[PDB]
Structures are given as C-alpha cells and as structure tokens.
Amino acid sequence: RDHRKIGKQLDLYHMQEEAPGMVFWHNDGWTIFRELEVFVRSKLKEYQYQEVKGPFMMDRVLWEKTGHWDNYKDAMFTTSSENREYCIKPMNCPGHVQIFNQGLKSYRDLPLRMAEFGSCHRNEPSGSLHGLMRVRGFTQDDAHIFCTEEQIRDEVNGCIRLVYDMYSTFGFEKIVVKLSTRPEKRIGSDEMWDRAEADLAVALEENNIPFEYQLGEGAFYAPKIEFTLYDCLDRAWQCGTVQLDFSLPSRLSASYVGEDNERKVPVMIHRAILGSMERFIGILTEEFAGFFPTWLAPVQVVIMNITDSQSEYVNELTQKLSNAGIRVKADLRNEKIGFKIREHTLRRVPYMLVCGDKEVESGKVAVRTRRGKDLGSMDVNEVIEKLQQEIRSRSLKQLEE
Amino acid sequence: RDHRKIGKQLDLYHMQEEAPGMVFWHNDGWTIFRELEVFVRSKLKEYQYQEVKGPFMMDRVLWEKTGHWDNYKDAMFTTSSENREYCIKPMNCPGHVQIFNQGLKSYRDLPLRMAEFGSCHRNEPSGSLHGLMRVRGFTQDDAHIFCTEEQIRDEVNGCIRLVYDMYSTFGFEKIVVKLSTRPEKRIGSDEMWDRAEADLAVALEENNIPFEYQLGEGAFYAPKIEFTLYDCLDRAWQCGTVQLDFSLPSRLSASYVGEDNERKVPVMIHRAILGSMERFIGILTEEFAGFFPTWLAPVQVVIMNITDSQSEYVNELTQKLSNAGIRVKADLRNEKIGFKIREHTLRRVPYMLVCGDKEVESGKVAVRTRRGKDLGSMDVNEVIEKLQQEIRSRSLKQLEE
Ligand SMILES: O=C(N[C@@H]1C(=O)O[C@@H]1Cc1ccc([N+](=O)[O-])cc1)c1cccc(O)c1O
Ligand SMILES: O=C(N[C@@H]1C(=O)O[C@@H]1Cc1ccc([N+](=O)[O-])cc1)c1cccc(O)c1O
Ligand SMILES: [Zn+2]
Ligand SMILES: [Zn+2]
C-alpha cells in the first residue's frame, strides 16, 4: 500500500540521488498530474480565478522586503548572475503582487483572484525526504486574492467552500480544521493579528465548521486555517491552507485607488487546497491503493485480442475509442488471454475489452474490470457513452458497482 | 508592431529588473501560452508521443558526463545544497534519458517518442536581453526520440512533416532550411559525422526541401536541421531544430536489448518545432499585430448591455457561451455602450455582443467585431455553433471575414 511501491509498480514516476527530493514524472504519472490540473482549472473557471505564471527565481532584495529571507533563507536555493544573487522561489506570493503592481489598480478590480500552478523549491534536509510526501521541488495550486476589508468575509467563505468542493470529488469527507495563531517569531502589529485571527474564526462559525486553535503554528505574517483530511485508513493529512494577510501587500508597495479616491493597501488572502500536488498524488495513490478513478487512470481501457483474426477489429476499436477522448491502449501480443488480463489487472487498468470471433459480428465487446467483475457483451457505442459519462462526471465508482 | 509594446497594451506580460530576462505571464498572456500547449498536445497524440516532466536541476556530475559543463559552463546557473552542486537545466535531453534508463528496454519499445514542455534557464548577458525574443528562462516544446539506426528515417520524416504541419496553422509556409555541419570541437568519430550529416542531407532531398549548408555551426554532438520562418514582413525567424545524435545516449549508459538478444545503444533525435514558446508567442504577437485568431484570443467574446434591463439576459448568455467552451466575459459596468465597445476593440476581442431591449425580446444578439464589421442580429445558438466551428478548426480567418 506504499505509494513508492505502487508508483514504481505502475510506471508512475522515479527518483534518483542525482536530484534528491525531485520527481522524474513518467508518462503515466504525468497524465495523472495533468488530469488534476484540468480538474483544478475547471474549479478556477467556476470560482472566477485568473491563472498566471511567475518567474522561477527573483532578486534577493525583493525577498528582503517580505521578511521571508530573515526566517527561512537556509531553506532557500540561491544563484548569482553578474554580481547579483537570486533565490529560486519557495512560494508564489511575491511573484503575484508584482503582477498586481503593474498598472494602476482601482476598487473596481477587487476582489482580484490570481492563481498559479507554481513549482516551488525548498532546501530541505536529505534525511527528511520520503517519496512524494516530502520533496524539494513541488507544485502548488496556489492562489492569492486581493480585496478590500469589506470583501474579506465573502472571499474567505469562497475559499472554504472550494476546500470542501474539491475534497468531496476524491471521497474525503472526514475533515479536521485547525486555526493556527501567531508564532513567537513574527512581523506585524498586535491589533492587526487580532483582526486577522478573529476574521478567520468568524468565517468558520458562519459555515458551522468545528475547529481547534493551534498556538504558534501560523506563518510569521498571517494566521492560517489548516485543513486536514483523513483517508480510508484514518490517517491525518494536512493539505488545505487559508491565510489572511495584512502585512505583505503593504511591504511590497501594493495599493489601489479606493471608493473615497484615496490610497489603500489591499488585503491578501493566501490559499492552497491540495497543497503540494506531488504530495496529493501520493495521498491519492495510497487512498485508492493504485485503483485510481477512471478519470484519473493513466490508461482507462485496454483492448486485447484472442488470435490474430481480431487484430484488425481491435485496432479499429482502439482508434474509435481514442477519437472519443478515452485513454485506450491495444494489447496485440501473442500471449494467452488469462496472461494479458492478469498483467493489466496488476496495472490497475479500470476496464479490459476482450474481442473474440464472437465479437466480430456483433460490434460488441466483452468487458471486464480490474476488480475481477464480468459485465458481458453489448454495444461498443453503448460502452463509449457509458464511459464518457464516467470521466466527465469524475465518478468515484465504476460501472455496475 | 512591436511585441513588447503591444504586450503592455493587451495585459500579455511584463518584465522588470528584479528578474531580468524572465517573463511575468499575466492572465491574458498565459491564456495564449496554455492555448498553444493544447495545440501542441493535439499533435503529440496525433504523432504518438509520450509526455513526461523532469526536475528543474540535476547533479552537475552528469553535466560533466555529457560534456555540456566544459563547453557551456558560463551559461548554466548553479546552486549549492549539502556540499553538492546542482545545475538548473538548460536542456531537457539528459533528463529524458533518465526516464528511458529506468526499466530494461527492448527493440519492441522502439521507436520511443518522449516530449516535454521543459522550462530551461541559460545565463545570457543582461545587456543581451530583449523582450520575449531573448530571455534567460524559457519553455521549449522539446522532444527526444529513441530508435534504431534503421528507423533513422521514419522518425526524421515525421519530424519534418510535423514542422510544416504545425507552421501552416499559424500561416507560415515561407520556410528556408539550413544544415549545420560539424564544428571543430565535437565528440564522436569522424564516421558518425559522415553518416549523421548524410542522413539529414538525404532526408531533405527525400522531402523535396531545398537547403544550404552552415559549415561549423552544428552542436558538438550532432548535426542539426534548422528551420527559419518568415512573417508577413519577410523577417527571418529561426525556430525549428532537428538534431541527429549518436553520442550522448552512449555517454549516458542508455541501452536496449535488440532482436539478436544483445545490448545495443539507441539513436537519439533532438527536435523542437516552435522552439522557445515565449519567443514564438512574441512572433505571433507581431505577426497578427495583436489580432490573434479566435482560438488564440485570451478573451473570445464580450457581451455588453445598454441598460440594467438586459442585465439578466446577458448573464444567461454568458453562462450559455461559457458552458459551450468559449472564453467569454460579461461587461455590466455603468458606462455608455460606445465606451464599452471602444475598450474591448482596443483589447482586440474578436467578437462583441450587444443586447438591447429589442435583443432580449427576440432571443437574438447583435454581433459585430474588433475590425468594425457587422453580422447584425443573429440567433444565439447560431453564434455559438459558428464559434465552435471557428475554434475547433483553429481557422486563421474570421466569420464571413
Ligand atoms: O504557506 C503555505 N503552505 C505551507 C508552507 O509555508 O509550507 C506549507 C506548504 C508545503 C507544501 C509542500 C511541501 N513539500 O516539501 O512537499 C512543503 C510545504 C501557503 C499556503 C497557501 C498559499 C500560499 O501562497 C502559501 O505559501
Ligand atoms: O537546438 C535546439 N533548438 C534551437 C536552438 O539551438 O535554439 C532553438 C530553440 C530555441 C529558441 C529560442 C530560445 N531562447 O533562448 O529564447 C531557446 C531555444 C534544440 C532542439 C531540441 C533539443 C535540444 O536540446 C535543443 O537544444
Ligand atoms: Zn502565499
Ligand atoms: Zn535536445
């Protein structure tokens, strides 16, 4: 049930000592990563988010405004070019405000939701690395919301609704929520920290979410709501995070023209639902034990022949299935039929299509699943329509179960 | 007609001194970038390519083993972690071999086409940077093909066919081709360069492509076919590149089991159709002068109302168009209709939908475009149906236009 074993077991990814804590995404594993992007982007469109991309390193002088350099430079990778030092970004927060700073902003642009699949890098000790859970290079479904102090309620509520919306897709309904308060090493005034912590607390009571305080576990600049999901083994996994920031936008000279035609500093809301997408894939790998849902399966359908007589028929079906948007692979090897089914069952392919000579009239296929179920013969167009409903709805369970 | 100058007007991107030669992709520009990615991925599926992803840096010890460290030490960024050097990758070729190296490969796995949108970094001089044309961090539509020497066609013609097939979508068929031969400082025996240069030379005569030699301009490991396209201003732009490599796979301990059950070294073919996608977007920006085709437009349709009476009707239309897969924005601001139309016309939005009281009764919409042309009032379903017809085929030209 170990994702490292399943990942090697399913051709998902690999790692080696030349790049410690960094993922070599294979074709099958990268398909799952891209499928998660499509799912996230569908939510971004639904929740009216922009999608941007920032540069991969920046001047240390910029990281100096934020105080990020003071707290965690030891965790930061560094490079120099023409007597200037640059830091490979561990977070997308200052990159997003720079985009916000371009062009004069007004209150009519707020709330401004800006998201990015930012690939970050943190210099973690090699002894702390373990599979996809703890890595040096990871990708966040990061987003930062710029809004006025009157829009704080509505925007934080939208982030909370998004957390439960996406977690329910993967079947994670046991969620533990914690409020991380101020740490001993922080920046910002006491009264700022009071308002930010209270606002996060109020947002949770409005949505009727029980939670407990976690003293000293917040960021040095913002308190954060931490979402923890429980898998089918009742194991805690901390993925979600919503922070309320009144500090950084002021430090990075971010401003907008208000309703009263005056200088105001915008409130920034950090959010990340899945957290590290490499980590989230590892959670999904262990949660399903490699039995990914059909919409996430690297190979969704495998069509196999019994003899060479159906090799022409199988290739036609493989092309027809591929044209319908289904990830389908053809198994034309000269191996016994029980041998083929066992191999692809171990590959956790959701459906296996069997084509004998009895199939060659009928325009039909013998369907069997990775669970060992037999579904019998009927229409190829019917299975296409049956399947397409399954991927488009991102259903957790398969056909006839 | 300058891309940097249009790019500021259209919310495409921006750059600043904190990250010289690196792009801050804004929402509108990133839409074009992703929009090109889908087009490339459609070709990868068509031409049977895998898609992988490599880490951002690797142990320098490998960059010695390839010879890249000796030749291009000044152009590579370097960082430190636990008394070990890592280099932010300037190329994706050896990262692809690592994926190929995992698991024993045979001749039945060949040809193996592996593609990646690899984000590279080269330390180019800062006085040398200019907009999107010359950048420090760029994304290549890279791919490397592993095959036997008898397959040295079937892949090279596929690369050549892909070059002209993808260029025709953007309207580039004025293409001049050059063949770069061996430089004095290279690796491999002379007999490789005789076969490798000849293999590329015959392939161009094979495809009825006139070409000129560029003596001494090839890489230290491979001769290269260079594709140069000309825009509407008859300006040369060098984007395509196909390399024939017999050296590095041997240097990186890549091997496969042949038909005679003996270890063999696979041939590697470097290819890049668009080259740096940041550069290609800048070329496209200048080629169309900001008038991107509908399938490439960041915002495809803007629906505007005249008064608040049509505010419900436009919102229904925005949802219907958005559900149809059209990037649509609704303009409900309290401004005059002539003010709204002018703003989006300067934004080069392909189509603008106007809804008066006469539109909401009749169930139709008034459409007329960024160039000033009228389609009059047309059926709402008709406008959707034609648009999908326009986007799906990636047509260069407009609607009756
Ligand atoms: O703060 C954030 N998140 C934690 C933080 O900091 O680390 C937390 C996230 C994390 C993920 C993966 C790995 N990993 O090595 O696999 C380590 C750490 C954060 C949250 C939302 C938006 C933002 O813009 C953030 O910055
Ligand atoms: O050679 C290659 N491709 C051209 C080449 O060289 O430049 C061409 C592509 C390009 C254009 C612009 C910029 N840029 O800095 O904006 C960078 C790169 C190449 C092809 C395949 C694999 C490789 O490993 C390569 O190296
Ligand atoms: Zn943040
Ligand atoms: Zn290459």
Please report which helix (H) or strand (E) contains residue A199, including its range: helix A190-206
Of the residues A8, A61, A102, the best mutation for testing chain B's interface (the one with the most B CB atoms within 10 Å of its CB) is A102
Spatial distance between the Cα atoms of B312 and B314, rounded to a whole number of angstroms: 6
Task: Name the residue range of residue B207's domain.
Answer: 3-54+93-288
Peptide bond into B94 cis (omega under 30): no
What's the gap in Å between B76 CA and the centre of ligand 4? Answer: 16
Residue bearing tokens 């592996």:
B114
Question: How far apart, in whole angstroms, are the C-alpha atoms of residue A314 and residue A319?
Answer: 9
Helix ranges (DSSP H) in A110-189: 152-169
On whether residue A134 sits in a domain, the answer given is yes
Domain end marker among A288, A312, A330: A288
Distant-in-sequence, close-in-space partners of B90: CB < 8 Å, separation ≥ 6: B68, B72, B75, B76, B120, B121, B122
Which atom of ligand 1 sits closest to the CA of residue A270?
22
Separation CA B7–CA B28 (nearest Å) = 10
CATH code of the domain in which A230 resides: 3.30.930.10
Q: How far apart are CA B62 and CA B116, in angstroms?
A: 20
| Alpha carbons A322 and A299: distance in angstroms, whole number | 11
Q: Nearest ligand to the C-alpha of residue B89?
A: 2
3-class SS letters over B13-66: EECCCCCCCCCEECHHHHHHHHHHHHHHHHHHHHCCCEECECCCEEEHHHHHHC
Report residue B107 as tokens.
Answer: 């001749």
Tokens representing residue B20 in the block:
């010289």
Token pair for residue A166? 């996406």
Give CA angle at B135 (B175, A141), nearest 5°: 110
Contact A141, A274 (CB under 8 A): yes
Domain annotation covers residue A75: no
Is the distance from CB of B119 to CB of B72 less than 8 angstroms?
A: no
- Contact (CB, 8 A) for A89 and A75: no
Please tell me whether residues B341 and B281 are part of one structural domain.
no
> Which of B323, B30, B313, B267 is closest to A50 using CA atoms?
B30
A144, A340, A347, A364: the active-site residue: A144
User: Is the Cβ pair A53, B30 closer than 8 Å?
Assistant: yes
Radius of gyration of chain B (CA): 25
Could you tell me if B124 and B142 lie in one domain? Answer: yes
Residue A279, CA distances (Å) to A12, A23, A134, A249 in order: 13, 11, 7, 29
**By what method was this entry solved?**
X-ray
**Count of domains for chain B:** 2
Taking ligand 3, which is a single-atom ion, which protein residues have CB atoms under 5 Å away? A 93, 270
CA distances from B297 to A32, B38, B121, B319 (A): 28, 14, 28, 19
A199 lies in the same domain as A239: yes
Is B113 in the same domain as B186?
Answer: yes
Length of chain B: 401
Domain final residue pick, B288, B314, B332? B288
Beta-sheet pairing, B211-214 with B256-257: unpaired
Answer yes or no: do B223 and B346 share one domain.
Answer: no
Instruction: Give CB contacts under 8 A, 24+ apart, made by B357-366.
Output: B357/B306, B357/B307, B357/B309, B357/B310, B359/B310, B359/B313, B360/B309, B360/B310, B360/B313, B365/B303, B365/B317
State the Rg of chain A over Cα: 25
Strands (E), B128-280: 137-147, 175-180, 211-214, 224-230, 236-245, 256-257, 263-264, 267-276
The number of beta carbons lying within 10 Å of the beta carbon of residue A176 is 15
Q: What angle do CA B394, B400, B401 make, to 5 degrees?
A: 75
Query: Same structural domain for residues B241 and B339?
Result: no
CA of B133, closest atom in ligand 2: 16
Q: Does B400 fall in a domain?
A: no
Q: Which amino acid is at B154?
A: D
The amino acid at residue A163 is V
Resolution of the determined structure in angstroms stands at 3.0
Q: Check whether residue A344 and residue A386 sit in a common domain.
A: yes
**Quick check: A17 and B81 in contact, CB under 8 A?**
no
Catalytic (active site) residue A224: yes
Distance from Cα B272 to the centre of ligand 2, integer Å? 7
Q: Which helix (H) or strand (E) holds A210?
A: none
Helix boundaries (H) for B47-125: 60-65, 68-71, 93-101
Alpha carbons B393 and B387: distance in angstroms, whole number? 10
Tokens matching residue A258: 């208000």
Q: Is B169 a domain residue?
A: yes
Residues B125 and A82: their CA atoms lie apart, in Å, by 8
For the question of residue B121 being annotated catalytic, the response is no
Domain assignment of residue B209, yes or no: yes
Is A3 assigned a catalytic role?
Answer: no
Among residues A54, A56, A53, which one has the least CA distance to residue A79?
A: A56
| Dihedral of the alpha carbons of B332, B333, B337, B340, in degrees to the nearest 10 | -100
As a dihedral over the C-alpha atoms of residue B144, residue B25, residue A87, residue A185, rounded to 10 degrees, the angle is -130
Tokens 């249009």 locate to: B6
Catalytic position from the list B3, B89, B270, B370? B270
The residue behind tokens 């973690």 is: A124
Counting Cα atoms < 13 Å in the Cβ hemisphere of A222 gives: 23
Domain end call among A271, A288, A305: A288
